[PDB]
Amino acid sequence: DPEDELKRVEKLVKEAEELLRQAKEKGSEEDLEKALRTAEEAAREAKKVLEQAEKEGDPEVALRAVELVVRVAELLLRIAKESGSEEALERALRVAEEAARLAKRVLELAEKQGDPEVALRAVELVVRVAELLLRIAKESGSEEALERALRVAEEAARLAKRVLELAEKQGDPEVARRAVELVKRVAELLERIARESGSEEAKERAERVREEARELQERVKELRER
């Protein structure tokens, strides 16, 4: 039963977070390590649940699993920052990068099963992954992490178009409009990154995304007019 497995993963996540909390409390390194391990196991089981959800064809279970993976990734970032370990930070990076493409798999599964809401939430999840990658980029100072961040961001912005296409295919103006709000959300993110980091890529990507939202607004307008 996928539900029991999901609650299992959730319990593992909670347990890991409490292992981290105690690790900070009494200053235990072993608690920190076993917290890392617990989180990793949680992510593993979560990905397994996703993989069986692909075969079973349940988009909801998949989405829950992948956002649980994102949860695990954030947790690994926190564990990183607390431990000051480069290795744990790298693991957080890896789990985030995985969470991205897994969220994309949730998106395409939703498109196959014809579920606009789950696809939308999947794109939002990809955005969360992008922000997370941005945080990891901030902590590590790695340029590659920033590149990956922006890349994932604009990627989500682009998938939002596909979500809009599904929405206008099933005739759901609300999901499409919210998808446009998602596009302009990504736009605002890239704009912020361009403001603070003065990045060369952030500006261009923000321009592209803004153009995309400019078109998609007219498309949704067309959808609501008829």
Side-chain angles (χ1 to χ4, degrees):
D1 185 41
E3 179 185 8
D4 307 333
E5 303 179 32
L6 281 179
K7 291 187 297 181
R8 259 273 300 180
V9 177
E10 293 171 1
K11 184 187 177 304
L12 289 185
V13 171
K14 292 283 298 182
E15 180 176 348
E17 293 181 0
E18 295 292 338
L19 282 174
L20 166 62
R21 204 161 302 176
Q22 293 177 2
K24 300 184 302 180
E25 178 183 356
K26 49 190 171 182
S28 180
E29 196 83 356
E30 186 170 354
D31 291 34
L32 194 50
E33 297 180 10
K34 71 181 61 178
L36 180 71
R37 292 149 47 189
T38 306
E40 288 181 325
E41 180 64 30
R44 249 109 64 174
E45 298 185 6
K47 184 181 179 179
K48 296 176 183 177
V49 174
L50 164 67
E51 287 173 352
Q52 75 172 0
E54 291 183 344
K55 294 192 59 181
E56 291 181 351
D58 200 336
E60 184 178 6
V61 184
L63 178 63
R64 232 307 173 191
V66 175
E67 65 191 7
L68 277 177
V69 170
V70 174
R71 175 95 174 270
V72 170
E74 298 178 351
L75 178 54
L76 292 189
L77 173 56
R78 292 143 66 188
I79 292 181
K81 294 183 182 179
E82 274 296 329
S83 66
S85 179
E86 181 176 345
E87 191 182 49
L89 187 54
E90 289 169 353
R91 297 186 179 192
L93 180 58
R94 296 301 182 272
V95 174
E97 292 180 3
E98 181 72 18
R101 59 184 72 103
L102 293 192
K104 183 181 179 181
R105 293 167 69 174
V106 161
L107 176 145
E108 64 193 19
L109 180 63
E111 290 184 345
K112 292 172 183 178
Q113 241 75 221
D115 201 329
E117 296 80 13
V118 174
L120 181 67
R121 294 301 314 279
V123 182
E124 295 185 11
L125 195 54
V126 181
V127 173
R128 284 217 303 156
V129 170
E131 302 173 354
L132 187 55
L133 289 172
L134 193 64
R135 302 184 184 100
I136 302 176
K138 287 193 179 69
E139 183 71 11
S140 59
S142 177
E143 196 80 11
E144 294 182 346
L146 180 135
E147 302 289 300
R148 191 65 63 98
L150 305 178
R151 213 276 102 169
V152 166
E154 188 177 2
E155 178 181 4
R158 187 160 299 174
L159 294 178
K161 165 172 291 188
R162 291 174 56 179
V163 166
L164 186 144
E165 291 169 357
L166 182 62
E168 69 176 359
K169 273 181 179 182
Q170 287 190 172
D172 199 332
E174 175 65 25
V175 180
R177 187 200 61 84
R178 182 56 182 89
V180 174
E181 294 292 333
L182 208 167
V183 179
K184 69 189 60 180
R185 266 181 52 185
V186 179
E188 291 173 15
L189 174 60
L190 295 179
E191 285 169 10
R192 190 195 70 181
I193 302 174
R195 285 196 308 174
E196 53 177 358
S197 176
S199 178
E200 308 174 12
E201 295 183 347
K203 303 179 180 181
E204 307 177 4
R205 297 186 182 271
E207 295 178 6
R208 304 193 196 102
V209 173
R210 281 196 299 268
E211 178 70 19
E212 179 186 12
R214 187 183 313 174
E215 302 173 358
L216 266 51
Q217 177 64 28
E218 304 178 5
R219 296 188 65 178
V220 171
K221 186 183 305 177
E222 178 192 18
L223 182 58
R224 78 173 67 259
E225 287 300 326
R226 73 109 183 183

